[PDB]
A paper describes a structure:
Two [name]-[name] structures closely resemble each other, containing 14 CAC subunits which encircle the core complex. The 14 CACs were named [name] to [name] in a clockwise direction when looked at the lumenal side. Eleven CACs ([name] to [name]) constitute the inner antenna layer surrounding the core as a closed ring, whereas CAC–l/m/n form the outer layer covering [name]/b/c. Except [name] and CAC–h, all CACs are grouped as four heterotrimers. One subunit (termed chain-s) contains one transmembrane helix and binds three Chl a, two Chl c2 and three α-carotene molecules. Chain-s is sandwiched by the inner [name]/b/c and the outer [name]/m/n, and forms multiple hydrogen bond interactions with [name]/b/l/m and PsaF. The only difference between the two [name]-[name] structures is that in the [name]-14CACL-phase complex, one four-helix-bundle protein situates at the lumenal side, while in the [name]-14CACS-phase structure, it appears to be missing. While the two L-phase structures contain PsaQ, we did not observe the density corresponding to PsaQ in our two S-phase structures. Moreover, the two CpPSI-ACPI complexes purified from L-phase cells exhibited structures almost identical to our two L-phase [name]-CAC structures, and appeared to contain the lumen-localized PsaQ (Unk1 in CpPSI-ACPI)12. Together, these results suggested that PsaQ is strongly associated with the [name]-CAC complex in L-phase cells, but does not or only loosely bind to the [name]-CAC in S-phase cells. The final overall resolutions of maps of [name] [name]-14CACL-phase, [name]-11CACL-phase, [name]-14CACS-phase, [name]-11CACS-phase are 2.7 Å, 3.0 Å, 2.9 Å and 3.3 Å, respectively.
Numbering used by the authors:
A (entry chain J): 1 to 42
B (entry chain A): 11 to 189, 192 to 754
C (entry chain O): 22 to 125
D (entry chain L): 2 to 152
E (entry chain B): 661 to 733
F (entry chain K): 10 to 42, 51 to 86
G (entry chain C): 2 to 81
H (entry chain D): 3 to 141
Write the structure that this text describes.
């Protein structure tokens, strides 16, 4: 892949959007498979 | 042949290199950030092409390709509306039963309990009720199935790809030269004749050959899948003749000028279709055909390459009299060399047209079954009033940018601009006086009524029962429009709109339209409107007229369009720029449009919308309380805001709980905006100093030194969050209220 | 009639510019040039078989007979009066422009 | 021909010579108003301005005041006009006290004695015009209504 | 109004009003002793704060007294 | 509905008249181009005949409206 | 009037004098700096308090300091 | 040296932005300059005027208006032959700018430094030491 396009994907708004979309996505998946976790189960 | 196509081939190379260099477009930003202000400075000036480049040719090329990019976004958006109608909607159920099924084209995923938003809209469907009126558009088009909606979504996707390709091609491969863009006569000839006239003509052909037969069959009561496909209307003329017998004669009556043969499908009925509560589609077909001829004729006015036509410069330069000096001389040169002057005009016109669209669509409801879908009627009025107000304020923003930047006095000696600037004190002092007079004599009537009603003196009020302010001119104009069918429009059968007077139109036991009577409350709120429009003009006009210089700052043009102040001297010159009058005038636009949409909402619920019952009497939504309660401020507070906020604040646990949450969220954002509006930058920079100290202590200070936002950006952030919160609160309140009760 | 067509008065449209308002000729010519086409009859309920000038003059006389009482909201007087004076003011404006400016 | 020129031949003063500002009709009206008319003492200027203002003041108070539907409507309207007159004369007097130094000149409005004369005349004429309006409305039933006695 | 809109706008309005008073006949006979200027930056902050605070106090006092009186509980 | 008529030679007459009228009148009024044999070309002919079908269509429809036909 | 001071950190760049809209500042001779000249404020009765001089100055904390004081017709920038 | 009052003014059509009653009762400012051409400029108070070839003269209400025009002419038309005067209602004319024949940004002998403080700005006195004392905070 082109190094200037990879340097564009390393810019702050792209990495910020990708990282928090990934973060949002595994919170969504964790609350899909394990919903309503009001407490640490113990 | 001085109108010719001229193109530079391969101007700009298609490279990813400048993507990796944020700020490449300006000399200041291209050397990289040293403070966080650079980041904000990067986004603020990016589409300001004439601040980066000196040449009008490169500016014009960037604008043309950015317009293709905008068209690509609009086509993708339309494609998604059609795809969501095809795939995630109850459109087919709505076609079978319109007056019972509620339109819904948005379905949510089940994640955190949010699937409560998939409410029971009807037709064996669960989803979010949609209020954009797409279903009524599609039924007017004659869609009748989800398959045709899939083909429309694909057509939108193909157009979106073609526009993004064309923007790339016309910037990087084939960019026109400046002399191509500076063809105002050619562009107007093609945009009147070609864009508007052919567009109207082609739509008229669709209405005559597709919309009119499908909708006649639908309103007769034929089931949607029992209706013939639209091309069998095109080929078999016999079935089309069975619906409208004039088609048995074909195009011989058109060419021989025996046009009254076509009166089956080219009517001038007026009024509404009783079955659907919408405009007669035979009227809309005749309307579009008439417009097409007028627009195509209009397109032959200007001179391009053969000697026939007008010179626009000669028309402008000939209109000058004894009051106005050199007249309109020099305006052609302005409007073909300044993009901002053109954007100022076109934004004022687009905003005005959007406000006209808002008025004309509730009063003469054009689509079948849109008049009795009250959430859609309220939604499309409120939406087009907000688009109109925003675009009107952007016309004054770019008039200010023209005056500061593109205006040159040498070419504007003693013409109309020079003369306006040379008596701007007389203009602003007379406008200021009008705004004071009209605020006293409009809002002071409300304050007089609150005081008298509170004091027990109801005979001393401005009301129908007491002292009467009667809107005699508007009542008289309503009389004229009710008398017009058969009198001053003799071939009309019904009035243009039943709002002026006449019958009550009922569809599915709900009122489509009925006369909107005017009383003392209507006089008062109309002068409230005149007052809020006048002062908004004063703030924007004062900003445009004093953008270059004042008695306060004699060299305001050297500071620019957007500067925060010129120091604390001369008593203090905070917010002296033209930008700061756009900033202050968007608040007054917000005030004006909020009272307009509140007036519309309360008046339609109180006096127009409702359910027809036995004996022909109509029970309105709020039972006719507008007349005696819109005359005090306490009436608006209690009987409009408090009474109708019941549905938004009781919405939790229902499908309208999303509106309940957005009501609070927008109330929050609005309050949060006042942190930015009431504060000053210097406090926040000194607070940031102590926070920087705590980062310095742990050796974690950033290399991009944090700054408080600029004075101008602090104002812009405050205004943006103010507009978002105020409009969002109204949006949530209006939508939860009218979905529950209408 | 602040100044007639003849060079007789000293009325200055402004501080130092004398300008002959041709109030007799413009008022007379605009009146006749608006009233004479407006004689065109029309079998419309507003006109009643007359022209706009003649139906208007008839509605002046009818309402003057009931002198204290004003014409009602639905009375044709107001619509006749509006259109008549609208086209009359427009013909005075255009006539003043044509006569004062082109002078021939 | 052009109708807008520099004010009094001066291109750099903050005014323009427009038809509303400086036509013959405007100059005739301005030159003949009592404030600007030649040959009038300040007291007579006060009398004519006062008679005019006092006469029209009676009407809004009488027709639209709190006691308008009572039979004392004209009495209350006159007395309300009188109250406004007394407050305005207090305003004129304090303006004269704080705006003009004491000099012998008395035939100009903008002198201390000339202002005191104008205030004396304005009070007398104002009460006189209000009294005249009271007499006319008291006796003529046309004025008591808006002309509504004819219908 | 005092907290969102600032001085430079109002000083330019007041200069158009000063011009209008000086040019209007029958009104230019009356003259100010003090030149009309816009409020100062600090003064406007204080005026907006006083209006804000007074509105806060009067609104809450009306609510807390009337709601308790009307309900009696 | 205003009454229009099927095509007859009178309709042809109105069209021809308006067309010739617009040729001659346009020939004088047009400001950029042997009374008709100097500088008369195809765009002038096509423009005068386009205004001729506009004036003629308006004249035919109006004379059909009022009863002259 | 406003009171304008020049402190001896002035490098003689003349930027304040060129930036002043009301001709308050001028350059006088002084051996303290490399440029051989320092700003001076002889005409502070004409100072409107704009502080454009302070914006123009490049020393770390400003060599020229304007102290807003009593207001006059001149310092209020009033053309009326 | 003194203002020759008879100098013709630039052609101008008038405006509402010019001077008011305070100019004829408090002070007025004048600016004169030499132009090589008959050319259009922008007035500080409004629209456009045309400067006459030779010597021009204006009257403005503020000194800053005279200096704003002076900077505009110097950058736009390369004219530095401008003299700014203050004129009082007694008729007395006060030459103002450039004050000693030399522009302020160029050094001149016989200029005495006013406002100069012998220490840096951080060496000033705290307010408490000079409270109820007439002594100045500048050391
Ligand atoms: C243009 C307007 C538009 C809008 C507002 C929506 C909105 C929606 N669509 Mg629809 N849709 C549209 C057009 C639109 N659509 C079109 C044109 C098509 C045809 C292809 C579809 C086809 C479609 C289907 C088939 C479905 C939806 C669905 C949805 C919903 C959820 C979407 C979601 O969360 O996926 C999120 C999906 C992701 C993959 C997340 C991506 C997030 C990334 C990180 C965004 C980043 C952008 C990027 C960084 C930009 C920079 C580029 C880069 C080089 C730096 C939502 C209501 C769903 C629905 O309605 O379910 C009931 C659904 O299943 N849409
Ligand atoms: C008949 C000729 C014609 C037509 C239809 C248009 C149409 C348009 N021009 Mg114009 N233009 C023309 C000639 C024409 N131009 C000429 C001769 C010049 C040179 C003087 C220009 C110079 C010009 C500039 C400089 C700009 C435009 C822009 C635009 C767009 C305006 C935004 C809008 O409403 O789009 C939305 C409406 C639509 C209807 C979208 C339609 C998309 C296609 C292109 C329409 C035509 C398709 C084709 C003819 C139809 C085939 C029909 C077939 C199926 C039977 C619009 C597509 C602006 C723009 O947005 O640029 C992209 C712009 O900045 N034009
Ligand atoms: C700082 C405040 C705060 C705190 C402490 C929490 C904490 C929690 N929220 Mg709440 N929430 C917050 C802010 C907060 N939220 C805000 C601002 C919103 C609005 C966007 C929400 C909206 C929200 C919803 C709608 C839901 C939660 C849920 C949850 C739980 C998720 C546990 C988890 O991830 O397990 C996931 C599994 C793992 C193995 C990890 C947890 C108790 C969820 C829940 O479980 O409720 C009990 C849930 O349904 N929150
Ligand atoms: C751009 C718009 C557009 C388009 C593409 C079409 C296309 C068509 N029209 Mg329609 N039409 C239009 C506008 C349009 N029309 C408008 C504006 C009107 C109103 C005046 C009509 C009124 C009309 C009639 C009345 C008829 C058509 C017919 C036709 C077909 C032409 C067949 C033919 O030549 O024999 C025509 C017949 C002769 C005897 C010759 C064709 C499908 C004809 C057809 O086939 O009907 C389905 C037909 O009878 N059109
Ligand atoms: C056809 C419309 C049109 C066009 C082409 C332009 C084009 C331009 N304008 Mg104009 N303008 C318009 C409409 C338009 N404007 C309208 C409607 C207004 C009234 C509000 C203005 C007001 C205006 C001002 C006051 C200014 C401009 C400026 C500019 C220029 C710079 C643009 C830029 O870099 O912004 C970059 C774009 C952004 C930073 C986008 C952020 C804007 C908002 C906050 C985001 C949108 C929020 C979103 C819709 C909702 C969020 C949802 C929420 C719930 C999360 C450019 C010439 C500026 C200039 O200096 O030009 C010389 C300038 O100061 N314009
Ligand atoms: C409730 C809040 C409020 C109120 C009353 C006002 C009032 C006013 N604004 Mg402000 N403004 C506001 C909020 C408000 N604004 C906000 C939030 C902004 C932020 C962006 C602005 C920004 C702004 C600008 C930028 C402009 C105004 C202008 C105006 C004036 C309009 C002219 C007018 O109506 O005069 C009539 C006065 C009123 C209607 C006020 C109410 C008076 C009523 C009738 C009662 C009077 C009682 C009486 C005097 C009592 C006497 C006795 C008592 C002393 C004891 C007026 C002074 C404009 C202006 O000055 O142009 C003329 C203008 O340009 N305002
Ligand atoms: C309503 C009546 C009317 C109309 C339409 C005209 C129109 C015209 N006159 Mg005439 N004129 C009139 C009354 C009128 N005049 C009267 C009453 C007098 C005597 C006092 C004159 C004396 C006069 C002289 C002495 C001369 C003219 C000339 C002209 C021509 C150009 C100058 C001008 O006035 O621009 C008007 C421009 C236009 C009408 C075309 C612009 C198109 C727009 C759409 C204007 C529409 C305005 C308005 C809405 C139309 C109202 C019509 C009706 C309903 C009242 C123009 C054809 C001059 C000329 O060219 O000689 C032949 C000339 O020398 N006129
Ligand atoms: C000499 C032939 C002639 C005749 C007798 C008429 C007569 C008529 N025309 Mg036609 N017309 C003509 C030539 C003619 N016109 C020409 C040459 C054109 C230019 C193309 C037009 C363009 C034209 C249009 C565009 C329209 C008429 C209409 C009308 C009628 C209604 C006018 C009216 O009272 O509205 C009064 C309306 C007012 C607002 C008056 C106030 C009237 C019978 C109108 C109509 O209703 O046709 C059915 C219509 O729409 N005419
Ligand atoms: C109409 C018109 C048409 C065209 C447009 C227009 C110009 C704008 C408009 C004009 C409108 C306007 C503004 C019209 C304005 C009209 C006005 C204000 C007329 C005022 C009249 C005052 C009178 C008669 C006072 C009389 C006092 C007397 C006799 C003294 C009596 C007393 C004295 C001292 C002596 C002792 C006895 C008593 C009784 C005590
Ligand atoms: C809070 C505040 C600040 C400080 C605000 C700052 C420094 C903003 C920093 C917030 C973070 C760093 C970014 C905000 C991102 C949010 C999550 C929302 C982003 C919105 C889009 C821009 C992405 C000012 O600088 C200021 C200046 C003038 C008047 C009022 C104020 C003011 O009120
Ligand atoms: C409206 C407004 C003005 C104009 C306001 C003015 C000129 C005040 C004039 C009000 C009248 C003239 C007097 C006010 C009288 C009050 C009712 C109280 C009088 C004094 C009592 C305390 C006794 C500013 O000057 C201003 C300046 C800086 C930031 C914001 C603003 C601002 O918002
Ligand atoms: S306050 Fe902020 S804006 Fe007003 S002057 Fe001082 S700095 Fe400029």
């Amino acid at each position: 892949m082109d190094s200037n396009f990879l340097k564009y994907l390393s810019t702050a708004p792209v990495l910020f959007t990708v990282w928090l979309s990934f973060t949002a996505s595994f919170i969504i998946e964790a609350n899909r498979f394990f919903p309503d976790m009001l407490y640490f189960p113990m | 042949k001085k109108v010719s196509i001229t193109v530079d081939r391969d101007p700009v190379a298609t490279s990813f290199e400048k993507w990796a260099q944020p700020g490449h477009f300006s000399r200041t930003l291209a050397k990289g950030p040293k403070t966080t202000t650079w980041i904000w400075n990067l986004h603020a000036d990016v589409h300001d092409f004439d601040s980066h480049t000196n040449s009008l040719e490169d500016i014009s090329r960037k604008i043309f390709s950015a317009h293709f990019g905008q068209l690509s976004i609009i086509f993708l958006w339309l494609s998604g509306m059609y795809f969501h109608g095809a795939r995630f909607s109850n459109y087919s159920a709505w076609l079978s039963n319109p007056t019972a099924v509620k339109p819904s084209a948005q379905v949510v995923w089940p994640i955190v309990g949010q699937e409560v938003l998939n409410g029971d809209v009807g037709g064996g469907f669960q989803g979010v009720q949609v209020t954009s009126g797409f279903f009524q558009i599609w039924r007017s088009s004659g869609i009748t199935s989800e398959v045709e909606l899939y083909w429309c979504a694909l057509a939108g996707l193909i157009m979106s790809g073609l526009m993004i390709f064309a923007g790339w091609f016309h910037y990087h491969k084939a960019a026109p030269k400046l002399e191509w863009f500076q063809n105002a006569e050619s562009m107007l000839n093609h945009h009147l004749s070609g864009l508007l006239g052919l567009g109207c003509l082609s739509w008229a052909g669709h209405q005559i050959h597709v919309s009119l037969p499908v909708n006649k069959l639908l309103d007769a009561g034929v089931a949607p899948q029992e209706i013939p496909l639209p091309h069998e209307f095109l080929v078999n003329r016999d079935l089309m003749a069975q619906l409208y017998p004039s088609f048995s004669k074909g195009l011989v009556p058109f060419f021989t000028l025996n046009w009254s043969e076509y009166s089956d499908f080219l009517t001038f009925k007026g009024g509404l279709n009783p079955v659907t509560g919408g405009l007669w589609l035979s009227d809309t077909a005749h309307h579009h055909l008439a417009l097409a001829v007028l627009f195509i004729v209009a397109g032959h006015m200007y001179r391009t390459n053969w000697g026939i036509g007008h010179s626009m410069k000669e028309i402008l330069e000939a209109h000058k009299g004894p009051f106005t000096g050199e007249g309109h001389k020099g305006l052609y040169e302005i409007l073909t060399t300044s993009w901002h002057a053109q954007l100022a005009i076109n934004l004022a016109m687009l905003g005005s047209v959007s406000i006209i669209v808002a008025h004309h669509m509730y009063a003469m409801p054009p689509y079948p079954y849109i008049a009795t879908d009250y959430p859609t009627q309220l939604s499309i009025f409120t939406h087009h009033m907000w688009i109109g107000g925003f675009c009107v304020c952007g016309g004054a923003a770019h008039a200010g940018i023209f005056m500061v930047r593109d205006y040159n006095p040498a070419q504007n000696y003693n013409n109309l601009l020079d003369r306006v600037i040379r008596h701007r004190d007389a203009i602003i002092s007379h406008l200021n006086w009008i705004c004071i007079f009209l605020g006293f004599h409009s809002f002071g009537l409300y304050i007089h009524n609150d005081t008298m009603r509170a004091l027990g003196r109801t005979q001393d009020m401005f009301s129908d029962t007491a002292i009467q302010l009667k809107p005699v001119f508007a009542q008289w104009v309503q009389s004229i429009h009710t008398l017009a069918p058969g009198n001053t429009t003799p071939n009309a059968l019904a009035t243009a709109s039943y709002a002026f007077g006449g019958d009550v139109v009922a569809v599915g036991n709900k009122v489509a339209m009925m006369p909107i009577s005017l009383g003392t409350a209507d006089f008062m709120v109309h002068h409230i409107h005149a007052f809020t429009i006048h002062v908004t003009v004063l703030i924007l006009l004062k900003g445009v007229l004093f953008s270059r210089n004042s008695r306060l700052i004699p060299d305001k043009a050297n500071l620019g369009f957007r500067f925060p102040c010129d120091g604390p001297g001369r008593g203090g010159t905070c917010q002296s720029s033209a930008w700061d009058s756009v900033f202050l005038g968007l608040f007054w636009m917000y005030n004006c449009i909020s009272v307009v949409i509140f007036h519309f909402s309360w008046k339609m619920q109180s006096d127009v919308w409702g359910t027809v019952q036995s004996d022909g009497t109509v029970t309105h939504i709020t039972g006719g309380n507008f007349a005696q309660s819109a005359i005090t401020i306490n009436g608006w507070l209690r009987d409009f805001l408090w009474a109708q906020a019941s549905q938004v604040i009781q919405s939790y646990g229902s499908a309208l709980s999303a509106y309940g949450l957005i009501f609070l969220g927008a109330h929050f954002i609005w309050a949060f905006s006042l942190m930015f509006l009431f504060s000053g930058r210097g406090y926040w920079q000194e607070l940031i100093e102590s926070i920087v100290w705590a980062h310095n202590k742990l050796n974690v200070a950033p290399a991009i030194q944090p700054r408080a936002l600029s004075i101008t950006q602090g104002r812009a952030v405050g205004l943006a969050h103010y507009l978002l919160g105020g409009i969002g609160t109204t949006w949530a309140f209006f939508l939860a209220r009218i979905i529950s009760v209408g | 009639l602040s100044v007639v067509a003849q060079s007789k008065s000293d009325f200055e449209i402004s501080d130092g510019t004398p300008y002959t308002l041709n109030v007799p000729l413009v008022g007379a010519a605009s009146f006749i040039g608006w009233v004479v086409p407006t004689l065109l009859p029309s079998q419309i309920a507003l006109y009643g078989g007359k022209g706009l000038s003649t139906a208007f003059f008839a509605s002046i006389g009818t309402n003057l007979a009931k002198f204290p009482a004003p014409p009602g909201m639905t009375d044709p007087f107001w619509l006749l009066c509006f259109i008549w004076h609208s086209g009359l003011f427009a013909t005075m404006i255009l006539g003043s422009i044509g006569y004062n400016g082109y002078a021939g | 021909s052009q109708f807008i020129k520099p004010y009094n031949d001066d291109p750099f003063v903050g005014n323009l010579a427009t038809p509303v500002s400086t036509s013959s009709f405007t100059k005739s009206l301005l030159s003949n108003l009592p404030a600007y008319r030649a040959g009038l003492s300040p007291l007579l200027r006060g009398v004519e301005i006062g008679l005019t203002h006092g006469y029209f003041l009676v009407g809004p108070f009488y027709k639209l005041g709190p006691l308008r539907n009572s039979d004392v409507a004209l009495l209350s309207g006159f007395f309300s006009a009188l109250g406004l007159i007394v407050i305005l004369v207090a305003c004129l007097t304090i303006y004269g006290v704080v705006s003009f130094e004491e000099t012998e000149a008395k035939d100009q409005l903008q002198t201390a004695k000339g202002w005191r004369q104008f205030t004396s005349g304005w009070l007398v004429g104002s009460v006189g015009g209000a009294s005249f309006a009271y007499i006319l409305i008291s006796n003529i039933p046309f004025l008591q209504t808006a002309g509504m006695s004819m219908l | 109004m005092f907290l969102i809109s600032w001085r430079g706008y109002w000083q330019e309005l007041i200069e158009t009003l000063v011009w209008a008073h000086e040019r209007t006949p029958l009104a230019n006979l009356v003259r100010w002793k003090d030149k009309p200027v816009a409020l100062s930056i600090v003064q406007a902050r204080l005026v907006g704060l006083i209006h804000f605070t007074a509105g806060y106090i009067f609104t809450y006092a009306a609510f807390v007294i009337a709601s308790t009186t009307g309900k009696f509980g | 509905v205003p009454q229009t008529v099927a095509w007859s030679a009178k309709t042809g007459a109105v069209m021809v008249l308006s067309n010739i009228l617009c040729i001659v009148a346009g020939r004088y009024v047009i400001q950029v181009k042997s009374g008709s044999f100097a500088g008369f070309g195809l765009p002038e002919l096509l423009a005068s005949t386009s205004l001729g079908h506009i004036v003629g269509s308006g004249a035919i429809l109006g004379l059909s409206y009022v009863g002259v036909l | 009037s406003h009171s304008v001071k020049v402190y001896d950190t002035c490098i003689g760049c003349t930027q304040c004098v060129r930036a002043c809209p009301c001709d308050v500042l001028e350059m006088v001779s002084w051996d303290g700096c490399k440029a051989g000249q320092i700003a001076s404020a002889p005409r502070t009765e004409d100072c409107i308090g704009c502080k454009r001089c302070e914006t123009a100055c490049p020393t770390d904390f400003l060599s020229v300091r304007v102290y807003l004081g009593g207001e006059t017709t001149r310092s209020m920038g009033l053309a009326y | 040296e003194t203002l020759n009052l008879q100098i013709p003014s630039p052609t101008f059509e008038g405006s509402t932005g010019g001077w008011l009653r305070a100019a004829e009762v408090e002070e007025k400012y004048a600016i004169t300059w030499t132009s090589p051409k008959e050319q259009v400029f922008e007035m500080p108070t409004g629209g456009a005027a045309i400067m006459r070839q030779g010597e021009n003269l204006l009257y403005l209400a503020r000194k800053e208006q005279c200096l704003a025009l002076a900077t505009q002419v110097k950058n736009s038309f390369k004219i530095t032959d401008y003299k700014v005067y203050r004129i009082f209602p007694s008729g007395e004319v006060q030459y103002l700018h450039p004050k000693d024949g030399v522009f302020p940004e160029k050094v001149n002998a016989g200029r005495v430094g006013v406002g100069n403080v012998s220490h840096s700005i951080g060496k000033n006195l705290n307010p408490a030491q000079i409270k109820f004392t007439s002594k100045s905070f500048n050391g």
